[PDB]
Amino acid sequence: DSEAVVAVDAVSFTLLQDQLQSVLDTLSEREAGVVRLRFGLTDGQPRTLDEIGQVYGVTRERIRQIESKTMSKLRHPSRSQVLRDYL
Amino acid sequence: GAMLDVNFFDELRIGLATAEDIRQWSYGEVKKPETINYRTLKPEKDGLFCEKIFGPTRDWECYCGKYKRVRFKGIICERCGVEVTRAKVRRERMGHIELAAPVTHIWYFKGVPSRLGYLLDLAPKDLEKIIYFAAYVITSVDEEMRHNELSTLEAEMAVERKAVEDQRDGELEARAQKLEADLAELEAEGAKADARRKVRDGGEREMRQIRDRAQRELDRLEDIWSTFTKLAPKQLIVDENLYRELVDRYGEYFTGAMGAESIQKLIENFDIDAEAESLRDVIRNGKGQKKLRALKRLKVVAAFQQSGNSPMGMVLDAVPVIPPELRPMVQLDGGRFATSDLNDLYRRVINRNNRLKRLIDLGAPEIIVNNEKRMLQESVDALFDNGRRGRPVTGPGNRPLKSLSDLLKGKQGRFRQNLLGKRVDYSGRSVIVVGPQLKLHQCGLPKLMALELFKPFVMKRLVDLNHAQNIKSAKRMVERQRPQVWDVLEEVIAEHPVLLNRAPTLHRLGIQAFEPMLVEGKAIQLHPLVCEAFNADFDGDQMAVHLPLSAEAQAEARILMLSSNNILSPASGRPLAMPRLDMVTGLYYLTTEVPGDTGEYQPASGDHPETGVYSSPAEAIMAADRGVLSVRAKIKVRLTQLRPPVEIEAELFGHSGWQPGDAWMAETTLGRVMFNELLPLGYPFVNKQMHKKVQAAIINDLAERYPMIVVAQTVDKLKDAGFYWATRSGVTVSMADVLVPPRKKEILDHYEERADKVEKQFQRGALNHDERNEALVEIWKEATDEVGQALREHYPDDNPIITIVDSGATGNFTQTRTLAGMKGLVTNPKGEFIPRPVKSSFREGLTVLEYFINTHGARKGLADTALRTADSGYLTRRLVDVSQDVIVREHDCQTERGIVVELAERAPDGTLIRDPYIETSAYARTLGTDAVDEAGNVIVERGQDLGDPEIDALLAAGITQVKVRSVLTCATSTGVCATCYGRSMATGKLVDIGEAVGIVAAQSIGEPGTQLTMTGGLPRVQELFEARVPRGKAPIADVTGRVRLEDGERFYKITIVPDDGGEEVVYDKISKRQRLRVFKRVLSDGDHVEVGQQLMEGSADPHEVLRVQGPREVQIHLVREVQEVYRAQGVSIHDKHIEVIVRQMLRRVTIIDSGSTEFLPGSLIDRAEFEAENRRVVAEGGEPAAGRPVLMGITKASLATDSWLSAASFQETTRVLTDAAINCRSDKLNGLKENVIIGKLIPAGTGINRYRNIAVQPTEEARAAA
Amino acid sequence: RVLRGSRLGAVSYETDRNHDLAPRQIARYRTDNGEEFEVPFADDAEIPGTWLCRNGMEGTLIEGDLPEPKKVKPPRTHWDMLLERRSIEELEELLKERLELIRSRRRG
DNA sequence: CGCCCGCTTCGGGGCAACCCTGCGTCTAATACAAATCCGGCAATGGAGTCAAGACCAGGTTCG
DNA sequence: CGAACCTGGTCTTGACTCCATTGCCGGATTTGTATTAGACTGGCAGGGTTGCCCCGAAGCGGGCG
């Protein structure tokens, strides 16, 4: 049955979710909030910069600047080797 | 009810499903014969795979693709209609098919007995004509309207009949006028009188044709009138033209239909209580076949009345559909699709139903609609059970389709597979090799396999130590085999037991746990002392390795199933970890004694002293390391570390000569001192020659008087010493060591001359063929034994071929006779003896014809081996299937009854000689009464284990008969009690309160059946447990008195004269091939015989000894007859393993008087249930039932159980399941068979409630310690 | 050597959340024989008038909104097959001839 | 003294449950209508993107 | 100690722009139904094996004469 559960990828997914939660907790509150609401990490709905700037009360461009800053922050070897080993 | 099923269960109630429940389980009506799209490979709408009906194929996605998130859950799309959920709901959602016309179930119509035919009291060959549209039936009648209008109706009948009469009178008058004109035109002209008579006879034949045509019309009208008078319901009207003539006249006075709707209407207008009370009255006031048929129908009538069922569900109006994941259409690599063979049956049902609907909406003549309904009925029948009615519906290549019922019955059903067992994860196998350095609780392991078994453990451990960042890099590190994984593997392997297993698993010691340790190479190293338990040699056998996972499984494998905890048999109590083939030879050479070897002690004291003494075994070991002392020479050591025997201890020290300091001299060899140093300190000195039976006695005494760990360490020490001295023993084989007897040839010539005289006497004609065959067989048997005797007395004692035999290591003497000496007689293919015989031996080399003669017996032995192991497996299955529900429940049932044991009857001189069969019959049993000697003191009180020394004390006091407790007389209702079972043979202590003694007994009986080399073989056991009638059925008497022995012509007529005034019982057909029973001398005429004395020789059927000598004596006969078989091979089975099985035979009683409480004659119900209601029904209805003990075999008693789920797995899974479905039989899940099936915890061992709910908490004194 | 199979269905791996879902309404549908069924539709979604029920027959909505009742035609009759091949004068000819035949068979 | 008549006993038949002595190619299109795919512009409108550019706040340098 | 500056996130606004979302329309393909006028009018798996249960002749003994 090639469409079955491999039973190592499932626990790998759970461990990856836990490491992702810890890595996003190593950032600030607002940064983790805007990344989670950008990528739908908590409910499964990818909101846009309009909705993030609505829930935080700022422009869409400020949200985009914060998102680019956080994406540059996550693109570090020290911050991201443990996530690099998951792919 | 329960649809979530969270592991709490009490009952599994089956029942007959109705149309409302069928259309209430379903999630939608499937209405198209389509499965999948041929181009896009998606399920069609309203088809057999439809995502609206059964659910979504992809996880959390609708069909049109609008919703794809988990946030939309539990809702249904507006367009496509698929409820968004998981893709595992296609495993469980069912659908239904709406039939256009009703259809009977095939199960309640085409069985024996037919339940529809019994419920309606109609013959099955008429029911088949009704439901297959071959004959009409009368679904209703109106007796009152015919009753008050029959005068006018017969008046109109008379009017029509008289109109036919007047018409035929006019026809006869017209023919009379025409014949008068023929006569007047014939006799007026010149005509031939012969032709005139022919003309007159033609007119007469015309009017006779008129009159018998009219007679036939009147017979038709009176026949339809006779049938209209005898119009009763449930009447068949064959050939349909009488029916069509009977409809248009008086259609308003009766109705008649045809088929399943007619059967449904017949069941609809049916009262059950009326025929119920009618059958009650008939069985009250009947005799003969009528009462028997009314009983067999009252069975199913009261079955439908007593439960809350209804007979409406035997006709069917909606057919359910099994979910499509159980009948998947999976594609392979390359688009070769794979259907599941039920989709064709479902497609045929859907097609014929849709065609019938179209035909009914169109409007067609009756032939087409009846043919279509017949085809619909046969399609549903082929769906439920193919091949039941006539020829099966087949597929491509004349292969019959696996129908819906074929998933259950047969060898390939769900039940037989689910009892056959599943396949497991965390397992492995390899070839096995000997492990002669391991300790007894160890086993080797190929490290490349142990790295595969323990992969999650080693992954967690090398994540915990920082060698990888997650489990993904850890898994790749395991797969590349980086060199740190070996140390991590050793760390996780240490103290974690594994299971080992060799198929076939014959008995309880076929699975034994071990502690692993890493071993190079690729073969499993096995300890060389468990080969006797595993029945494994190293010729290429393979063993499976499993792996316990949880803490409960690890504790069970570490405590219950350890190798060093299981030394003794579960069957007889003898040890299985005893030394064998090599180490027995080693200890025999090490402990034997040679007269006059080097350094032997002589006391000859002339000029010089004795020079045989040694101050210590260390000094003796030095003097043997130097080439002076041989190991087997007799010396006199001064021992200070071994306990002396009882005589020397009582002589030298009296009370307790505690040898850790004491000194004493002993005349032995050095070898027996080196042997006795292996034994423990408290064990006394032995000073014997270690034959195998001597080692058996030593290890039995060690197992009886010591803990288990001392026995395990002593067995390991004995293995090491036995191997190390087996190498130095010098047991080789050369052809200069296979010595021939010197005077063989003169012996052969003398018996050849005797055979020549016998052959010449046959050649004279003084005797037939068979007599000279018997004479030659006797002569050559004598010659074989003479040559064997001369060879036995020719050999020395230090010959290896006689040392290996006489030390009990392996082999017997007959193989040495066939090696050197003479082979002897050789059998035929049939079993006769070839009278030639072989006069050579395998040292001398045979010739061509002698080899060709030997091959017959060799091949017969091989085929016998194959057949015998198959039959032993089947018998083990039957015994386990019977006695699986006999488990120990209480500690003491506190009865007073008990069996009696013979236990060493005396001599004519008066001396109590010990009976040979004590250790199987009387040992390990608990005394039910006390033991008094000559009205003196009570030697052994009630409630003692009856080991060795109290049996020796009873024999010393001089008592023989003792009343002991056993499981035949136990008084608990659910299983046996612990005191009645006595000592468990595997431990030596009392049995526990959770043991499954039934399976232990069944395996102990069925295991040594392969060694039963033969009516005296394994069929003799099988015909005893089945309680069949034997072949050589010698009769038994019924009363005392002298016999009227009469030997008639070619068969005997044995009559018995009774002792008192009674009838003379005559036994009719006793053939002369049977023999007179010899007892006390041969049988004579007028022999005053006993009550149940066996008349001829042979074996009495146990049914007759039950009816004559009651229930106690048949248990004595059934055990002793089976135990006579196993003693022929020297196989020791304790009698409590057989007494468990015989207990299961006599549990039920027959009913001859029903009394007044819900009973029927011929029924066999439980003794514990028949008496318990009779305790209560004697008040308020005091008509007690009349019971009598019956003896039924194992195959019969296994079927009549209280759980339908266990009895479904046995035999006729169709028949077991249908009558359980009628009676609405609920299951209780109490046997350990059903709990295996549903995956619940079994009610034995660590599964009963005394052990499963132990609360564990640290002691409050030690709680404050940290 | 080994042969593999695959049902045509994707298998995901997520968390079965019970708390935060998309909210949804419930509507009742009514069949012909008094059967009622409740179907959970999504919020931002049109509620269709008719809906094929679990029972298998088509069931309308329990609140009266009057959709298009039939909007169909009968397919074809044997009378249509007769009428598309012959004229009513020929039909009346056969009818009058059959009426005279039943007349001469009944009372004539 | 003989004679009927159901009761029991065995035979034969009948039937229910499993394997292989089991395990074929077929007129041939037309006519038409409805449904559906799909290919390609043709309105977008919201969402992302660049860039300027202002907003002070507290180190940082200089007076 | 006071002023100028550098650079920190912080936030607005104007402009660009880009790609999904319907939407229409024309055509291509794909699937479903109706129609063909010499006359033609009742077939094939299949048996064989093994074992067990249910009814019919038949002695036959007891009631009957």
Ligand SMILES: [Mg+2]
């Ligand atoms: Mg072997």
Ligand SMILES: [Zn+2]
């Ligand atoms: Zn959908």
Ligand SMILES: [Zn+2]
């Ligand atoms: Zn008991």
